Ligand binder design. Structure first.
Ligand SMILES: Cc1nc2[nH]c3c(C4CC4)cccc3c2cc1-c1nnc([C@@H](CC(=O)N[C@H](C)c2ccccc2)C(C)C)o1
Ligand SMILES: Cc1nc2[nH]c3c(C4CC4)cccc3c2cc1-c1nnc([C@@H](CC(=O)N[C@H](C)c2ccccc2)C(C)C)o1
Ligand SMILES: [Cl-]
Ligand SMILES: [Cl-]
Lengths: 340, 340
């Protein structure tokens, strides 16, 4: 075939990071379906090829595993699926409708990549060992591989949600996202799960700090689904710790949350009283290898934050509790894609 | 001379990290003055030589500067000053008393190294530029150079304080150090300085969390002078921010401090409401190059924490305030020297 040729060609191009403004303008109306088709038929191959080339540069002990080869198979098939539209006519609406349907198939084809790549980490641990150097090499690749996946799925979802059929939300982006509302939604979901497994759930306490406009609700341009995922994973760990640490007690400390809006950053602290974690083991929380056993929520949650020039940091105090801050860019002009 | 020969010989030996227990046993009584003399006459050259060899492996643009050469001069002179005692007799008390006096001279000879090395950073900035790669290379060396200085001064102070003339404190180590008392002492000093420059000072609030012994005062084996230095620098920055941020307000938020004692870590959080720092600029607080202008308190404060397997981490929220946690090892068995 020509798959090694396509990868070599499109790997010479560099991924083009986009800004929240560019995302909003790409989906301003339905007349830009042809501009997105002309852009995605060239951008998606570049991003798919750049990561495919790094996969092929992995050590043979990792590359020959059935997991890496099954994922590499999907990427090749999705690349070729997009090759077909490079010569078609944007003016023909049938070319556009078939492109949208093709992206949905590519999206469902890669919907089980995180579990598949997790099976490979477990295989490597039991096949070669859990060496400190093996952790960094696997951390380096998975952080870049998962961040690339998030970028490709963002492009696909922005096209299949805006350019389907015929606005408050511009696809997956909400230009007036109330952070507190997403915090409550994530807490309510974790509460339902915690109330059924432990028969007890900590309460919630939200506090907003709008520095330049005191008492003005905090809004931002962001992907609420990504913020929900990060907050949902943090709440689950905070509740399990708050409950399991007070099983022999009657007081159940609440999970407090602070939303602060500055001139450049929008932070979301989350505090609990779960007995903290020793500093020596804090690295294991964001480690794919040390989080594998016969979940990648926190490692991937930090990638969702870094996807738009953010970060997710943890700082605990053994004997008391743990804190978690989601650092986001408050301004849309600074919210640009971070691509590997 | 033979200085390049001594460096080559003693650079083949590796620095021997010591534990709090070993420090306590070395100064248990005055009968160990000869055991410390036999140990320090061999250990100090090794530590002095290992850092001197890294200084000589620096780039010529940094090595030829007058600052690096003035410090390199002091190190060579101190090495030679210790060479003289390698052949003397430990049984002769005059050999011991002259060794103590020699260490005091070496201590006062290197008492102005941090300012001298800071002048070199400023010279480099104005001579070659403040490049991101230049920051990491200077950060890598100064962190290791200053940490080596702290280790050498710890050995010297433990000998000149225990073996002088003829116990609650074992030299600079307090086997029953109340963390809260050191926090109050550091706050009181920063309050006096803040009350004179700003005519206003935030208040203090301490809370202890002894997990295994609730309401039992928290004590540890540590060097109170090192803990005072770290807390004193953090209080100064927290007060300036709390005051300068509320100059147009009447409420002056307090600086809260949490002391937590776990099974492995002893943490000291310090919170303020000074308007926080953007995440993009948090790295500048611990950067020697970005903290230089025509202080190294925070960078060196983090080294004092890492000296015994600790750490000092900062996490801010722009628009609200900043938090600082001093991570220390609660158990003496885990408090071992971290040497470059
Ligand atoms: C006590 C505890 N507080 C925690 N609070 C957390 C927060 C809140 C928002 C600030 C966010 C993210 C993680 C934790 C977390 C973990 C643990 C914890 N406890 N053990 C562990 C180990 C890993 C592990 O097995 N983690 C499972 C999922 C877990 C078990 C019990 C409670 C919570 C998580 C570690 C020592 C390597 O981490
Ligand atoms: C607002 C502010 N809160 C702060 N709170 C701090 C804490 C407390 C215990 C948790 C510890 C250590 C440092 C800060 C700190 C710095 C600044 C700050 N503000 N600007 C800066 C710049 C550097 C600088 O010039 N720092 C001077 C010494 C300073 C000026 C005014 C207040 C405090 C320090 C930075 C953007 C690169 O850092
Ligand atoms: Cl994927
Ligand atoms: Cl020195």
């Amino acid at each position: 075939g020509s798959a090694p040729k396509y990868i070599e060609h499109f790997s010479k191009f560099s991924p083009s990071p986009l800004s929240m403004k560019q995302f909003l303008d790409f989906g301003s109306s339905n007349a830009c379906e042809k501009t997105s088709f002309t852009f995605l038929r060239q951008e998606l191959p570049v991003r798919l090829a750049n990561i495919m080339k790094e996969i092929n540069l992995l050590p043979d002990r990792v590359l020959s595993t059935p997991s890496v080869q099954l994922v590499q198979s999907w990427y090749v098939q999705s690349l070729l699926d997009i090759m077909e539209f490079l010569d078609k006519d944007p003016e023909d609406h049938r070319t556009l409708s078939q492109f949208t349907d093709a992206l949905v198939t590519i999206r469902n084809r890669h919907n089980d990549v995180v579990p598949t790549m997790a099976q490979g980490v477990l295989e490597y641990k039991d096949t070669y060992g859990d060496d400190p150097v093996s952790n960094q090499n696997i951390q380096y690749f998975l952080d870049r591989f998962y961040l690339s996946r998030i970028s490709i799925r963002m492009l696909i979802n922005q096209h299949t949600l805006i350019f389907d059929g015929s606005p408050k939300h511009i696809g997956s982006i909400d230009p007036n996202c109330n952070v507190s509302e997403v915090v409550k939604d994530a807490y309510d979901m974790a509460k339902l799960l915690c109330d059924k497994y432990y028969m007890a759930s900590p309460d919630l306490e939200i506090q907003e700090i709008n520095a330049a406009n005191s008492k003005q609700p905090i809004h931002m341009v962001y992907v609420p689904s990504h913020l929900y995922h990060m907050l949902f994973e943090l709440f689950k760990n905070a509740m399990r710790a708050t409950v399991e640490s007070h099983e022999s007690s009657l007081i159940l400390p609440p999970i407090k949350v602070m939303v602060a809006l500055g001139e450049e950053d929008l932070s979301i602290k989350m505090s609990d009283r779960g007995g903290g974690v020793p500093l020596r083991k804090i690295e294991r929380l964001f480690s794919y290898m040390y989080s594998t056993a016969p979940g990648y929520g926190l490692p991937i949650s930090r990638l969702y934050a870094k996807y738009f020039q953010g970060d997710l940091q943890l700082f605990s105090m053994e004997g008391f509790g743990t804190d978690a801050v989601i650092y986001l860019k408050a301004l849309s002009t600074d919210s640009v894609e971070r691509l590997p």
